[PDB]
Amino acid sequence: PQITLWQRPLVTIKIGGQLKEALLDTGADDTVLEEMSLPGRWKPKMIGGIGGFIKVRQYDQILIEICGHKAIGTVLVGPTPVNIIGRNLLTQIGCTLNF
Amino acid sequence: PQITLWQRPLVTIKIGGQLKEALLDTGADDTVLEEMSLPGRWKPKMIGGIGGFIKVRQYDQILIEICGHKAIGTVLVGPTPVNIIGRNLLTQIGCTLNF
Numbered sequence: 325p326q327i328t329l330w331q332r333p334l335v336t337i338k339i340g341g342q343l344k345e346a347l348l349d350t351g352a353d354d355t356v357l358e359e360m361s362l363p364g365r366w367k368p369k370m371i372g373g374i375g376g377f378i379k380v381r382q383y384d385q386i387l388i389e390i391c392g393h394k395a396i397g398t399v400l401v402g403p404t405p406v407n408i409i410g411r412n413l414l415t416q417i418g419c420t421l422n423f
Numbered sequence: 424p425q426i427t428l429w430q431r432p433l434v435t436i437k438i439g440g441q442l443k444e445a446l447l448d449t450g451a452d453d454t455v456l457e458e459m460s461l462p463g464r465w466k467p468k469m470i471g472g473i474g475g476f477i478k479v480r481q482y483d484q485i486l487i488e489i490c491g492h493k494a495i496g497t498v499l500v501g502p503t504p505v506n507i508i509g510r511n512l513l514t515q516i517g518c519t520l521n522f
């Protein structure tokens with residue numbers, strides 16, 4: 325699909341058996357979601373953006389489906405204001421910027 | 424052009440006759456640049472990111488070139504970690520997400 329940027333590029337994702345709305349963010353190195361439970365081991369990480377850093381939990385090798393496309397990758401969980409799909413997963417679904 | 428996301432989508436922009444490196448960010452509503460000088464009067468604005476909010480100076484109808492594409496719009500200036508090109512200008516250059 326071709327997604328215009330007149331509005332925020334929000335899409336539905338499927339993760340941990342849950343359906344959520346997330347923002348396709350080319351400016352984000354990683355994917356970070358609001359508090360939720362995920363399987364497996366995790367390690368702490370500090371990620372920074374406008375306003376500073378927040379501490380999140382890092383889960384690796386997590387299966388996610390973005391707008392119909394399946395992928396696997398690292399997913400961070402923490403106090404993010406909105407669910408964000410970063411480059412680590414955008415690449416997997418073949419997402420590109422075009423102009 | 425078509426830009427993949429295996430690395431940060433950094434591009435060269437031209438503003439105030441000077442070249443700078445900026446991030447094409449589909450997750451950003453606005454365009455915010457690191458401290459610099461711009462002409463005219465500015466208005467206050469508070470913008471929020473993953474770490475919280477920051478106060479910035481808002482300048483309107485500013486000439487700015489992005490990857491050679493000319494645009495004229497709102498540019499925010501403040502303590503941002505990196506130069507960010509938001510949707511307000513990505514739409515002006517005809518940028519879309521595709522997969």
Ligand SMILES: COC(=O)N[C@H](C(=O)NN(CC[C@@](O)(Cc1ccccc1)C(=O)N[C@H]1c2ccccc2C[C@H]1O)Cc1ccc(-c2ccccn2)cc1)C(C)(C)C
Binds near residue numbers: 356372374471472
């Ligand atoms: C509506 O608000 C915005 O569009 N804000 C813009 C913005 O922060 N966008 N950001 C993404 C911005 C960025 O891409 C910029 C950046 C890039 C590189 C280095 C430093 C900053 C970002 O921070 N990226 C980081 C990042 C992000 C997620 C996971 C990992 C990482 C690591 C980094 O790559 C998404 C966002 C959207 C809404 C709210 C929000 C807040 C309050 C209320 C409602 N919503 C909070 C965060 C901005 C720029 C301040 C205009």
